[PDB]
Amino acid sequence: RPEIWIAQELRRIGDEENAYYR
Amino acid sequence: DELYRQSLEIISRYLREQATGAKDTKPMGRSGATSRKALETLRRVGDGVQRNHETAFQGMLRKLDIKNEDDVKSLSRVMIHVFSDGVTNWGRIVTLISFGAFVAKHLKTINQESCIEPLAESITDVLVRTKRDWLVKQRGWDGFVEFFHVE
Ligand SMILES: [Zn+2]
Ligand SMILES: [Zn+2]
Ligand SMILES: [Zn+2]
Ligand SMILES: [Zn+2]
């Protein structure tokens, strides 16, 4: 549950960063 | 396994740099040019992610509740889970590395004899082992450098 939330954040931030540089 | 060696080095050096705050002066050795540009790219975008997502990172570090330098099992499950949707991009990859550095910093405070090595190995293991062919197709760390190359 905490680990799922952490995964959600990293994924959200990761894709957001990807889009920016893309 | 050069891909793994190179990856572990770039990721280890960045984490160690972040935790100790001191740059390392050693020849990268093999494909040194790429590795240095990777470390440079990693400093720029890596520090940026930590700055721009300090609030989220602090919360994540809190829920992780990492007890020691060897307690990387949970983070490993987290990183695997991040890619469990089948999506792979450099944005996610560099974010995991940036958070790794954020964790490495916290480890120092609680004890200063912490190798960042176990942490760097956990991150490198996930990336290189579970995304082996994706990385190779992207020309490894040159693809990394290229993607984050800004004008
Ligand atoms: Zn961002
Ligand atoms: Zn140890
Ligand atoms: Zn293969
Ligand atoms: Zn240019």
mmCIF file of C-alpha atoms and ligand atoms in Angstrom:
data_model
loop_
_atom_site.group_PDB
_atom_site.id
_atom_site.type_symbol
_atom_site.label_atom_id
_atom_site.label_comp_id
_atom_site.label_asym_id
_atom_site.label_seq_id
_atom_site.Cartn_x
_atom_site.Cartn_y
_atom_site.Cartn_z
ATOM 1 C CA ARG A 1 0.000 0.000 0.000
ATOM 2 C CA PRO A 2 2.773 2.472 0.845
ATOM 3 C CA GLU A 3 4.888 0.851 -1.871
ATOM 4 C CA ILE A 4 2.027 1.148 -4.377
ATOM 5 C CA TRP A 5 1.681 4.849 -3.572
ATOM 6 C CA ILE A 6 5.434 5.334 -3.982
ATOM 7 C CA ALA A 7 5.286 3.591 -7.362
ATOM 8 C CA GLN A 8 2.424 5.888 -8.372
ATOM 9 C CA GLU A 9 4.461 9.006 -7.561
ATOM 10 C CA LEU A 10 7.621 7.891 -9.352
ATOM 11 C CA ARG A 11 5.576 6.919 -12.404
ATOM 12 C CA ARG A 12 3.643 10.199 -12.405
ATOM 13 C CA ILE A 13 6.842 12.220 -12.045
ATOM 14 C CA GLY A 14 8.745 10.039 -14.509
ATOM 15 C CA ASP A 15 6.213 10.445 -17.307
ATOM 16 C CA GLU A 16 5.905 14.158 -16.554
ATOM 17 C CA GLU A 17 9.679 14.562 -16.857
ATOM 18 C CA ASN A 18 9.697 12.459 -20.019
ATOM 19 C CA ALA A 19 7.087 14.656 -21.698
ATOM 20 C CA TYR A 20 8.988 17.820 -20.788
ATOM 21 C CA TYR A 21 12.252 16.754 -22.434
ATOM 22 C CA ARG A 22 10.453 14.975 -25.278
ATOM 23 C CA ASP B 1 28.864 -7.403 -19.135
ATOM 24 C CA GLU B 2 30.003 -3.877 -20.010
ATOM 25 C CA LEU B 3 26.515 -2.359 -20.062
ATOM 26 C CA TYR B 4 26.060 -3.300 -16.406
ATOM 27 C CA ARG B 5 29.563 -2.185 -15.437
ATOM 28 C CA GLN B 6 29.135 1.214 -17.085
ATOM 29 C CA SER B 7 25.640 1.657 -15.642
ATOM 30 C CA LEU B 8 26.686 0.762 -12.095
ATOM 31 C CA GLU B 9 29.541 3.251 -12.329
ATOM 32 C CA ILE B 10 27.522 6.227 -13.587
ATOM 33 C CA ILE B 11 24.757 5.556 -11.058
ATOM 34 C CA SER B 12 27.168 4.826 -8.191
ATOM 35 C CA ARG B 13 29.264 7.937 -8.810
ATOM 36 C CA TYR B 14 26.200 10.185 -8.962
ATOM 37 C CA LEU B 15 24.733 8.768 -5.746
ATOM 38 C CA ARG B 16 28.085 8.973 -3.941
ATOM 39 C CA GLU B 17 28.574 12.515 -5.224
ATOM 40 C CA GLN B 18 25.116 13.461 -3.973
ATOM 41 C CA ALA B 19 25.551 11.843 -0.559
ATOM 42 C CA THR B 20 29.069 13.111 0.185
ATOM 43 C CA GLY B 21 28.769 16.346 -1.782
ATOM 44 C CA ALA B 22 32.218 15.719 -3.229
ATOM 45 C CA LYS B 23 33.045 15.079 -6.879
ATOM 46 C CA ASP B 24 35.182 12.042 -7.699
ATOM 47 C CA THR B 25 38.412 12.487 -9.652
ATOM 48 C CA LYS B 26 39.107 9.142 -11.310
ATOM 49 C CA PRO B 27 39.274 8.271 -15.005
ATOM 50 C CA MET B 28 35.947 6.632 -15.894
ATOM 51 C CA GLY B 29 37.982 4.192 -17.925
ATOM 52 C CA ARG B 30 35.915 2.457 -20.581
ATOM 53 C CA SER B 31 33.815 4.552 -22.952
ATOM 54 C CA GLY B 32 34.776 7.364 -20.605
ATOM 55 C CA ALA B 33 33.427 10.114 -22.847
ATOM 56 C CA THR B 34 29.874 8.750 -22.776
ATOM 57 C CA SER B 35 30.004 8.097 -19.030
ATOM 58 C CA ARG B 36 31.107 11.651 -18.238
ATOM 59 C CA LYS B 37 28.435 13.209 -20.450
ATOM 60 C CA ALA B 38 26.007 10.859 -18.718
ATOM 61 C CA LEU B 39 27.180 11.996 -15.289
ATOM 62 C CA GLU B 40 26.942 15.616 -16.439
ATOM 63 C CA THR B 41 23.469 15.106 -17.895
ATOM 64 C CA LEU B 42 22.637 13.266 -14.679
ATOM 65 C CA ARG B 43 23.753 16.197 -12.514
ATOM 66 C CA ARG B 44 21.656 18.692 -14.465
ATOM 67 C CA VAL B 45 18.380 16.781 -14.816
ATOM 68 C CA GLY B 46 18.902 14.721 -11.662
ATOM 69 C CA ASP B 47 19.307 17.706 -9.349
ATOM 70 C CA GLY B 48 16.380 19.301 -11.172
ATOM 71 C CA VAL B 49 14.015 16.422 -10.404
ATOM 72 C CA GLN B 50 14.958 16.532 -6.712
ATOM 73 C CA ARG B 51 14.425 20.302 -6.560
ATOM 74 C CA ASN B 52 11.172 20.291 -8.513
ATOM 75 C CA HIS B 53 9.686 17.329 -6.642
ATOM 76 C CA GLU B 54 11.092 17.873 -3.157
ATOM 77 C CA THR B 55 7.653 17.643 -1.533
ATOM 78 C CA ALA B 56 6.708 14.357 -3.210
ATOM 79 C CA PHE B 57 10.192 12.919 -2.648
ATOM 80 C CA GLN B 58 10.121 13.731 1.076
ATOM 81 C CA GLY B 59 6.817 11.883 1.368
ATOM 82 C CA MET B 60 8.121 8.894 -0.582
ATOM 83 C CA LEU B 61 11.259 8.700 1.560
ATOM 84 C CA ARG B 62 8.982 8.746 4.593
ATOM 85 C CA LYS B 63 6.773 5.853 3.488
ATOM 86 C CA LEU B 64 9.835 3.884 2.397
ATOM 87 C CA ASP B 65 11.112 4.007 5.982
ATOM 88 C CA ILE B 66 14.476 2.565 4.913
ATOM 89 C CA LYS B 67 16.302 1.231 7.965
ATOM 90 C CA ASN B 68 19.855 0.777 6.660
ATOM 91 C CA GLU B 69 22.152 0.759 3.630
ATOM 92 C CA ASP B 70 21.186 -2.857 2.943
ATOM 93 C CA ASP B 71 17.420 -2.392 3.202
ATOM 94 C CA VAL B 72 16.836 -1.997 -0.535
ATOM 95 C CA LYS B 73 14.314 -4.818 -0.947
ATOM 96 C CA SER B 74 11.286 -2.526 -0.703
ATOM 97 C CA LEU B 75 12.717 0.048 -3.113
ATOM 98 C CA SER B 76 13.491 -2.796 -5.515
ATOM 99 C CA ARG B 77 9.848 -3.901 -5.419
ATOM 100 C CA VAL B 78 8.808 -0.280 -5.923
ATOM 101 C CA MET B 79 10.987 0.181 -9.007
ATOM 102 C CA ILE B 80 9.882 -3.120 -10.545
ATOM 103 C CA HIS B 81 6.303 -2.033 -9.887
ATOM 104 C CA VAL B 82 6.891 1.308 -11.622
ATOM 105 C CA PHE B 83 7.535 -0.512 -14.900
ATOM 106 C CA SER B 84 4.826 -3.127 -14.306
ATOM 107 C CA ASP B 85 2.537 -1.225 -16.680
ATOM 108 C CA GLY B 86 4.828 -2.027 -19.604
ATOM 109 C CA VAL B 87 5.826 1.588 -20.217
ATOM 110 C CA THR B 88 9.528 2.386 -20.583
ATOM 111 C CA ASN B 89 11.050 5.843 -21.024
ATOM 112 C CA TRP B 90 14.077 7.879 -19.918
ATOM 113 C CA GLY B 91 11.862 10.131 -17.813
ATOM 114 C CA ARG B 92 11.027 7.245 -15.499
ATOM 115 C CA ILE B 93 14.589 5.920 -15.550
ATOM 116 C CA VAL B 94 16.181 9.212 -14.493
ATOM 117 C CA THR B 95 13.444 9.754 -11.903
ATOM 118 C CA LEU B 96 14.280 6.436 -10.228
ATOM 119 C CA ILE B 97 17.962 7.406 -10.227
ATOM 120 C CA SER B 98 17.177 10.869 -8.848
ATOM 121 C CA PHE B 99 15.093 9.392 -6.033
ATOM 122 C CA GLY B 100 17.933 6.957 -5.419
ATOM 123 C CA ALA B 101 20.207 9.929 -4.789
ATOM 124 C CA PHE B 102 17.569 11.491 -2.536
ATOM 125 C CA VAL B 103 17.565 8.270 -0.505
ATOM 126 C CA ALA B 104 21.365 8.114 -0.485
ATOM 127 C CA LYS B 105 21.429 11.572 1.101
ATOM 128 C CA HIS B 106 19.091 10.489 3.900
ATOM 129 C CA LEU B 107 21.216 7.408 4.586
ATOM 130 C CA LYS B 108 24.269 9.562 5.239
ATOM 131 C CA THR B 109 22.610 11.558 8.015
ATOM 132 C CA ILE B 110 21.725 8.417 10.002
ATOM 133 C CA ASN B 111 25.209 6.987 9.564
ATOM 134 C CA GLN B 112 28.211 8.287 7.623
ATOM 135 C CA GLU B 113 29.735 4.861 6.939
ATOM 136 C CA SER B 114 26.973 3.951 4.504
ATOM 137 C CA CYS B 115 28.126 2.644 1.167
ATOM 138 C CA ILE B 116 25.694 3.944 -1.418
ATOM 139 C CA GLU B 117 26.772 0.803 -3.256
ATOM 140 C CA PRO B 118 23.880 -1.491 -2.235
ATOM 141 C CA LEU B 119 21.468 1.260 -3.310
ATOM 142 C CA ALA B 120 23.202 1.860 -6.642
ATOM 143 C CA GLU B 121 23.321 -1.879 -7.316
ATOM 144 C CA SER B 122 19.602 -2.266 -6.626
ATOM 145 C CA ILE B 123 18.795 0.476 -9.137
ATOM 146 C CA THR B 124 21.288 -0.717 -11.746
ATOM 147 C CA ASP B 125 20.054 -4.294 -11.391
ATOM 148 C CA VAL B 126 16.462 -3.322 -12.173
ATOM 149 C CA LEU B 127 17.298 -1.095 -15.141
ATOM 150 C CA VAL B 128 19.913 -3.272 -16.847
ATOM 151 C CA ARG B 129 18.371 -6.679 -16.129
ATOM 152 C CA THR B 130 14.677 -5.946 -16.739
ATOM 153 C CA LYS B 131 15.213 -3.427 -19.552
ATOM 154 C CA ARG B 132 18.347 -4.958 -21.092
ATOM 155 C CA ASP B 133 17.212 -4.961 -24.729
ATOM 156 C CA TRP B 134 15.406 -1.629 -24.467
ATOM 157 C CA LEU B 135 18.630 0.030 -23.319
ATOM 158 C CA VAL B 136 20.753 -1.606 -26.022
ATOM 159 C CA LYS B 137 18.308 -0.456 -28.698
ATOM 160 C CA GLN B 138 18.581 3.064 -27.268
ATOM 161 C CA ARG B 139 22.372 2.938 -27.625
ATOM 162 C CA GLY B 140 22.657 2.713 -23.844
ATOM 163 C CA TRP B 141 23.885 5.884 -22.161
ATOM 164 C CA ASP B 142 24.273 7.786 -25.432
ATOM 165 C CA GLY B 143 20.506 7.533 -25.806
ATOM 166 C CA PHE B 144 20.231 8.839 -22.258
ATOM 167 C CA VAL B 145 22.515 11.782 -23.039
ATOM 168 C CA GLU B 146 20.741 12.414 -26.345
ATOM 169 C CA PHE B 147 17.221 12.398 -24.897
ATOM 170 C CA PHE B 148 18.043 14.894 -22.141
ATOM 171 C CA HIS B 149 20.125 17.062 -24.467
ATOM 172 C CA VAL B 150 18.766 20.611 -24.265
ATOM 173 C CA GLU B 151 19.258 23.565 -26.610
HETATM 174 ZN ZN ZN C 1 9.145 17.375 -13.101
HETATM 175 ZN ZN ZN C 2 26.230 -3.666 3.514
HETATM 176 ZN ZN ZN C 3 19.170 -9.395 -25.256
HETATM 177 ZN ZN ZN C 4 22.847 20.955 -28.922
#
